[PDB]
Design a binder for this molecule. Structure first.
Ligand SMILES: O=C(NCc1cn([C@H]2CO[C@H]3[C@@H]2OC[C@@H]3n2cc(CNC(=O)[C@H](O)[C@@H](O)C(=O)N[C@@H]3O[C@H](CO)[C@H](O)[C@H](O)[C@H]3O)nn2)nn1)[C@H](O)[C@@H](O)C(=O)N[C@@H]1O[C@H](CO)[C@H](O)[C@H](O)[C@H]1O
Ligand SMILES: O=C(NCc1cn([C@H]2CO[C@H]3[C@@H]2OC[C@@H]3n2cc(CNC(=O)[C@H](O)[C@@H](O)C(=O)N[C@@H]3O[C@H](CO)[C@H](O)[C@H](O)[C@H]3O)nn2)nn1)[C@H](O)[C@@H](O)C(=O)N[C@@H]1O[C@H](CO)[C@H](O)[C@H](O)[C@H]1O
Ligand SMILES: O=C(NCc1cn([C@H]2CO[C@H]3[C@@H]2OC[C@@H]3n2cc(CNC(=O)[C@H](O)[C@@H](O)C(=O)N[C@@H]3O[C@H](CO)[C@H](O)[C@H](O)[C@H]3O)nn2)nn1)[C@H](O)[C@@H](O)C(=O)N[C@@H]1O[C@H](CO)[C@H](O)[C@H](O)[C@H]1O
Ligand SMILES: O=C(NCc1cn([C@H]2CO[C@H]3[C@@H]2OC[C@@H]3n2cc(CNC(=O)[C@H](O)[C@@H](O)C(=O)N[C@@H]3O[C@H](CO)[C@H](O)[C@H](O)[C@H]3O)nn2)nn1)[C@H](O)[C@@H](O)C(=O)N[C@@H]1O[C@H](CO)[C@H](O)[C@H](O)[C@H]1O
Ligand SMILES: [Ca+2]
Ligand SMILES: [Ca+2]
Ligand SMILES: [Ca+2]
Ligand SMILES: [Ca+2]
Ligand SMILES: [Mn+2]
Ligand SMILES: [Mn+2]
Ligand SMILES: [Mn+2]
Ligand SMILES: [Mn+2]
Lengths: 232, 232, 232, 232
């Protein structure tokens, strides 16, 4: 079988394993800061630099994967704590959408909320234009920030959040478990056919965005990943 | 919300927080050894001593859970490496079945392979009587060791195995990710209606068994768990 | 710290983690076959597709690494069993030298035996033009196939050879252990300043070559690697 | 050539291939436990029972060797996680020093830290009396626990650690690569003249020790070794 495995306990500028897009910076403590607090419609994205073959046109086989990551969102004075982080999967040539308005688009979609990606969003602002639920939520996104499904959640300022994601290729189930600061767990699961929605080779990463009035600290602290594709 | 959370980096004999059943022993290194290598049809089980409320009869709500554990199976001289470990969920009064034949029953079922439990087995012997697949496998069990579903796997002697399990109450999906020594991940997922198959309060744990000719080292090294049931 | 880690138990075409150069093919059994048995001066190379940051101009720190691989060389009818395999490190833009004569160059050097690389060669033909010792040998190469140091060895046709390599950044020592089919171990070690001989970002891989009359099967069976660079 | 080769996937107290010294026990799971958790100044050692000829007074030739082993150190409640494991080489008549104080001596030296051995220590306590560095460290020891050289390391409780050691007789270099649970590799290398420091025939093994208030689980899980001495 074909396996891709990596583990980041910290990050650094110049690490050839990570592609930096937009307003991303690496802090002295090793954290990734995705948005620029002084910029309007800020968008910052980080990608694992190696394309991952998630499915094969030869065998028809689809990879399974296990990934865990930790993030933090922190309020800043005066601005609205917005807009959130998305863990996403996209074609290997993925770039911040041209003319990105940031905000509710989470840096992966156009103004209408459409794009080419599969993601798990940690959304902290209700965008009526994208049919967002009225509170903070975890969403499963398929080519749109108008989530296929959401679950109520709560983004706690300065709290370290742990996430575990399992993609089971046979059932095509994307399962998500979010461990909050107060100890409670939040889960969401959705059948997503990665072979039907994505190309054979993709990139995995994180994206975050803000607007003129909606800005907050968006940090990626750690990330581990393992994918295995049966080669038969 | 109502949350049950715990973490075991090690185990100990004088700990009332764990129920020890049958042939289970705690080694000086802190590992749980489930079966007795010198006994015929050995069966040993461990349970978290506090019952977990997985569903409310008042609200009809079902808990989601996230659990991770690590184990080891090791071959022993002159015996068939058998029978395997099962991570299981059962009624609070669960005990080793009366007159247990061990072996293929994995210590949770009768001779016909029936019982009252939901489990994830790591099965290292092919029992034709329970319609086992021909190789080592991971299986999702519902009141039977004749698995609802299996996936081929490989039990590596002396290798430390890591498992992550997510139960998403809304989709009723039980997702499992198994991290092998060679780095590959094995996944299996199945819709299991925990509210329909189990009582309000349940016990979580591990069981393993052997027979006259089938014996191996079955170790539980660590276990973390979090369940959250919405109380509104 | 910054760590690159991977493990290949087998290989496959289309794996974006591997760069294929020249006459390389992947066999149905998962082995990499480096040279083309029907081509004159055949040269094939495989590289880990992600550049590795072996040192940083900012801190002056140099990475340490541990790598293990297994190979096989097998005689073919009529042709001379030649020329061998080289495990090498080179600048990230590395390509088969333009107008490569293959042969004793091992696919990493020019006709004079010069190049920009550090390698460990498993040499099966004595090239007087490169001051080769009179028998099969393991050599340590620094920008030349005229080895800095060699040790007598024996390439057994159809034998699976295991290699372990340690690079200790503090002493700048490149240590090599080769486990022969007859059970004996062969070692060779040399101080090589990777910071002085190579750029900050490099590629690791294998190369093999043949000539008109010198051809043999060159197989790469498995490869594991871990490098760690201390960061500011 | 003269070659000694062996491989232990498990160990037993009833096998003549190993010598057991002091407080060493073999667990039913097959692991070697070097120290007794309930004893003051506990010392336990194991040795490969056959003496290995590492050098020749006839030819002056010195053997090369490749060895790999895996261990685990685990914290115990109320005791300082101390003192560590040492992989050592010593005269064939080697015994635990008479009146051993355990602790910082790692079971191989006297109170002043002196002894007759060459070793690789995995030290988890800073003994100012032996000029220990302030954190956990891997050290190369020549007749003293006041290491010739050390490298910062981190002993993770309950983590399985993998070690590879290459001794190259021509350069007299002892190279060590340690693979941690967080994925990073730690290396240390030192020129050590075995002919000058040790007799022709030596014993290879492991030792660990504790004190009154410094105790932890010290386990040896597996060990493979190959040495080759040129007899021509
Ligand atoms: O004066 C009067 N009315 C006041 C008024 C307001 N205005 C205007 C002036 O200008 C404002 C304002 O209205 C809208 C306009 N504007 C401009 C903009 C532009 N930016 C924007 O829209 C945002 O920036 C947008 O980009 C955005 O929200 N991004 C999101 O930000 C998020 C973070 O927050 C996330 O990041 C997201 O992802 C991202 O999408 N946003 N808003 N003009 N007049 C009347 O007299 C009144 O007093 C009155 O009637 N009294 C009494 O009434 C009685 C009723 O019975 C009786 O009649 C009485 O007789 C009568 O006396
Ligand atoms: O494969 C195996 N065995 C095969 C086997 C044999 N059998 C047969 C054997 O025989 C039984 C049975 O099938 C039915 C049969 N029988 C025979 C009878 C007939 N008598 C009766 O009923 C009569 O009535 C009789 O009693 C009688 O006549 N008196 C009456 O007494 C009265 C007194 O008052 C009056 O006098 C009356 O007049 C008088 O009639 N009734 N029943 N079935 N399977 C291994 O063992 C198996 O364990 C194994 O492989 N282990 C595995 O190992 C693995 C590791 O390698 C893993 O660990 C696995 O997990 C683990 O599974
Ligand atoms: O160089 C190359 N190609 C060209 C070439 C030509 N030749 C030479 C060699 O030899 C021939 C020929 O040119 C002419 C020469 N000859 C032959 C003879 C014959 N005498 C006769 O016939 C006489 O008669 C003689 O026999 C005689 O006198 N008897 C006695 O005479 C008495 C008389 O009284 C009595 O009668 C006695 O009884 C009787 O015994 N006289 N002269 N050699 N190489 C290679 O391809 C090169 O590219 C190469 O190596 N690549 C490497 O390839 C490797 C794999 O291999 C690796 O892959 C490497 O990395 C790669 O670099
Ligand atoms: O060290 C240990 N144990 C022993 C010990 C002793 N101490 C204490 C106890 O004692 C000392 C000292 O600290 C200070 C204290 N002191 C001494 C004094 C002297 N009094 C005085 O001076 C007074 O004056 C007194 O004498 C007095 O009042 N008279 C009158 O004084 C008058 C003066 O005018 C007139 O003279 C009168 O005539 C006369 O009657 N005043 N204060 N600390 N530790 C550890 O266990 C050790 O083994 C250890 O760490 N192991 C390590 O463990 C690790 C795991 O953690 C790893 O496993 C390692 O590998 C392992 O190595
Ligand atoms: Ca939103
Ligand atoms: Ca079975
Ligand atoms: Ca050559
Ligand atoms: Ca010490
Ligand atoms: Mn949303
Ligand atoms: Mn089964
Ligand atoms: Mn050579
Ligand atoms: Mn020390």
């Amino acid at each position: 079988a074909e396996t891709v495995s990596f583990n980041f306990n910290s990050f650094s500028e110049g690490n050839p394993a990570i592609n930096f897009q937009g307003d991303v910076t690496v802090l002295s403590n090793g954290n990734i800061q995705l948005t620029n607090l002084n910029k309007v419609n800020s968008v910052g994205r980080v990608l694992y630099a190696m394309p991952v073959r998630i499915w094969s046109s030869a065998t028809g086989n689809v990879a399974s994967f296990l990934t865990s990551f930790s993030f933090e969102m922190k309020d800043i004075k005066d601005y609205d704590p917005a807009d959130g982080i998305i863990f996403f999967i996209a074609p290997e040539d993925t770039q911040i959408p041209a003319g990105s308005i940031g905000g509710g688009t989470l840096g992966v979609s156009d103004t209408k909320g459409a794009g080419h990606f599969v993601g798990v969003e940690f959304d902290t602002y209700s965008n009526s234009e994208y049919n967002d639920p009225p509170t903070d939520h975890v969403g499963i996104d398929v080519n749109s920030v108008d989530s296929v499904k959401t679950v109520p959640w709560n983004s706690v300022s300065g709290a370290v959040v742990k996430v575990t994601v399992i993609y089971d290729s046979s059932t095509k189930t994307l399962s998500v478990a979010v461990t909050n600061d107060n100890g409670d767990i939040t889960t969401i699961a959705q059948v997503v056919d990665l072979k039907a929605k994505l190309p054979e080779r993709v990139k995995f990463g994180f994206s975050a965005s803000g607007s003129l009035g909606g800005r907050q600290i968006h940090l990626i602290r750690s990330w581990s990943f393992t994918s295995t594709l049966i080669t038969t």
